[PDB]
């Protein structure tokens, strides 16, 4: 295996783009949603847990997520990237770029949880939760889906992390909101816009190469986001009598989340439909407690996107086609099972992480 | 034709960069220029018409702009990108990337109009105008210049859209301001800075490849922007006795607009001269009604850049050279004719789009 | 020598990223640190001196920095990029891209000085200082380190500009603060986040190619930044009893500065250690007059990073290995000598630039 420098270049820039999604995208997103007096402490928690994730990732996280082991975790042979030759190749890129790309996914997933709950949670408590949860939820689920583990080995389809990122974080957020118990819309908009732009590295980069699947993922991201903005805004216009900015921004996130598992597997007709459905699903979600509506958008649209990936991957619907020997009904069942496993896995581990913080330092911010 | 993955990578990142120019660049630019109480509604209109453009682009816009047809429009054989193989190659990149790149140009052009006028226009009215105007002005002009139509076939020079983007939008904006009848400078600056960075994807990406013409376009963008900042600020310092931030930011946009048609055709000596002249032209423009000075900068500097492309493309002036058999005088005439056609075409269609909104929903915001 | 289009693409995007660091990164960083009433004038000075640097760079700066001459400066054979064929290749990229990449380093270095002092300095005075200082400090030091001059020829290690950018600017800033005599933390955070993302083009781009050294520089940037955030925040938590946002952001800059000279030469274990030490060094620095703590972070962490590059480059410590015939003790001595030369060179020239402004227009803002 030799590294292709074009893919190297692509994947380094895509990594910078996914890092951009956390620092400052999600921070500004939540920054505009929470009360003014809580913004500074939230930005600090997002910055510091971000740093924590990057360090834990390189120390053991990448090895346990991406090393070969069992169905659930990898190994500890790549501690501090030991035994990874600088010139080692993973896919068509230097493995070091693969480390950085996959790490940036860990970052945004944790950022999604921490930004939503930072307002409510004690600082030392969130550090404890991130350690437990990254280690016991993010790493194994990443392994199961993208490290050749359980879900992958059953053919689960999840191009860029409807399960690993979105449902995983949504449930952890809901569990936290439950245990624990917009001031600036131009900032919300700015954070959303940065998330949007970053999400091209997230979705297109998940191809691992600057090929036609990256191209397809890129075009589907544009399409599903636009469709979800319009779906949300129409639903809002039909219901409230007027569109709002928060609605437009929420619609955009909804489409982005919806298309995340699907983007490299579906055609543009499917991205449009997933977009519309995700935007309206998101609107339904937030209408029907959910901290900064993390689940209403990431959770509901994550589930919707994962299921619809099992439909719209079909050749007959413009997608790339199911794997050899797989029917739509079989794929749908695998998508459903993948979503169920992710919900229970993340829920149990988040519960454990939050309880441990609470038993040691106390959860609620003094 | 085989896709080069280096060009694939380059052009996907350049597309993300041009998308960045609208979401959030132009939105923050206008956001800082208009009254505080109008900002939210403007951001909503920019976000939603952006979404609309992306959807119309993939549904029929790309096909009608880039399909082969006549001198004025393409065809409807690529509706929803039907009959475009995923592995289809356009130039040296996957055609799907070409769709996304060209679409992002449609977005920023509409963003330039909608951001300037959102404050004044009814929401449903702007949706109507965007449909009419994208379909009947943007698409045909894109076709004429970049889809092998009228202007291209006469050898018009317009590397990145002095006519298609800048003059097109400026006139539509002026027509709207006429029919219809800075609060936050750090936001203006931030929007300008984002437009600047995005504009590297806009200008250098227009080469379609990461070659020496992309390199040249990139260097000319840096140079013409810097020269226009200094030209504007000196003119302002000579006139008002002091430079201002809005002046510096306007100077930057002026240079960027000026160099847009020229950047891949001229040498750095020419970029410097175009820069200075565009900055001083911009300053003159805004000095001598023009909504958020859209025309004073995009219109005047667009015309100036298009004309000066017909001079500075000459080999003798450091440019790449006129096409075979073309003299400077002949090229100048083609540039002038291209500008005239674009002004009248955009003006008539914007008038039609605004009148239709006004006859159906009413133009002015209740 | 033929240009590799993958490296072309990479290096054009990296240049856009470094430009992003100034426009708007450092401007927003300082914008949030200085009093509200000084922000507009500071943003104007950053924008205009940025433009000035870009123009001086293309006119003579690139030629005098990167042309072949003596140990201290290049030549004037590339005035306005004359005698540089468009298809000329430097390393594995078109030389025009090398011009733009190196120019963007000049920009951020000047931005670091001007942003810190703009509040205090007369506008015409800063223009004078930038001309003198770019020409007589930045250019020769760039030449000595990266243009085959004195420091390079003695084997100084400085991957991305611990000396050329960070120490150079810190000293110029200290000299200015001496001669001359946070309002918005979400803005500080946003500027820091943009600096962070841009810094991937800065560090990884300094490889000049999308190879395994770019990959290594990229991963070390993530690691050293995260380690420095944690180092600073722990030191702050140990001292003040609580972490702060300004602390977290300062920690990030500290790590980024620290790893700058080292990132392409060290392993991830070394990046972690440099990170921690840089964060704690930065915290010590700002604790023990220093305009917007430019030296406390850029100066102290620059020195720390340059020294630690002479340790952590060793094969035995996970680095790439010292050059043939070089021991750790010899390398350390060269690092120390490089830092001393840079401090004295920049100090003397900044003194001269500030005195000349002061004798002609007066330094202090009326």
Curated annotation (Swiss-Prot), chains A, B, C:
Result of changing residue 199 to F = Retains 80% of transport activity with methylammonium as substrate
| Example GO biological process | ammonium transmembrane transport
Q: Which keywords are on file for this protein?
A: Ammonia transport, Cell inner membrane, Cell membrane, Membrane, Signal, Transmembrane, Transmembrane helix, Transport
Gene Ontology molecular function terms on file = ammonium channel activity; identical protein binding
What does the record say mutating residue 166 to A does? Answer: Does not prevent transport of ammonia. Loss of transport activity with methylammonium and methylamine. Shows normal GlnK-AmtB complex formation after ammonium shock. Loss of both methylamine and ammonia transport
Primary localisation category? membrane
Give the result of residue 298 to E/F, as annotated: Loss of transport activity with methylammonium as substrate. Shows normal GlnK-AmtB complex formation after ammonium shock
How's its activity regulated?
In the presence of high extracellular ammonium concentrations, transport activity is inhibited by interaction with the regulatory protein GlnK. Ammonium transport through AmtB is required for GlnK sequestration. Formation of the GlnK-AmtB complex is influenced by intracellular pools of the effector molecules ATP, ADP, Mg(2+) and 2-oxoglutarate. The rapid drop in the 2-oxoglutarate pool upon ammonium influx and a simultaneous, but transient, change in the ATP/ADP ratio promotes AmtB-GlnK complex formation.
Q: What is the effect of changing residue 364 to A?
A: Almost loss of activity
Q: Where is this site: Twin-His motif. Important for optimum substrate conductance?
A: 166, 298
Site described as Important for optimum substrate conductance, located at 202
User: Consequence of mutating residue 206 to A?
Assistant: 4-fold increase in transport activity with methylammonium as substrate. Shows 80% inhibition by thallium
What does UniProt give as GO cellular component? plasma membrane
What results from changing residue 158 to E? Answer: Impairs ammonium transport. Retains 71% of wild-type activity with methylammonium as substrate. Allows some complex formation with GlnK during a transient increase in extracellular ammonium
Q: How does it sit in the membrane?
A: Multi-pass membrane protein
User: Function, please?
Assistant: Involved in the uptake of ammonium/ammonia (NH(4)(+)/NH(3)). Transport is electrogenic. Following sequestration of NH(4)(+) at the periplasmic face, NH(4)(+) is deprotonated and neutral NH(3) is transported into the cytoplasm. Neutral NH(3) and charged H(+) are carried separately across the membrane on a unique two-lane pathway, before recombining to NH(4)(+) inside the cell. In vitro can also transport the larger analogs methylamine and methylammonium. Also acts as a sensor of the extracellular ammonium concentration.
PANTHER family with a match to the protein in the record? AMMONIUM TRANSPORTER MEP2
- Which family does the record assign? Belongs to the ammonia transporter channel (TC 1.A.11.2) family.
Stated name of the protein: Ammonium transporter AmtB
Provide the organism lineage as a comma list: Bacteria, Pseudomonadati, Pseudomonadota, Gammaproteobacteria, Enterobacterales
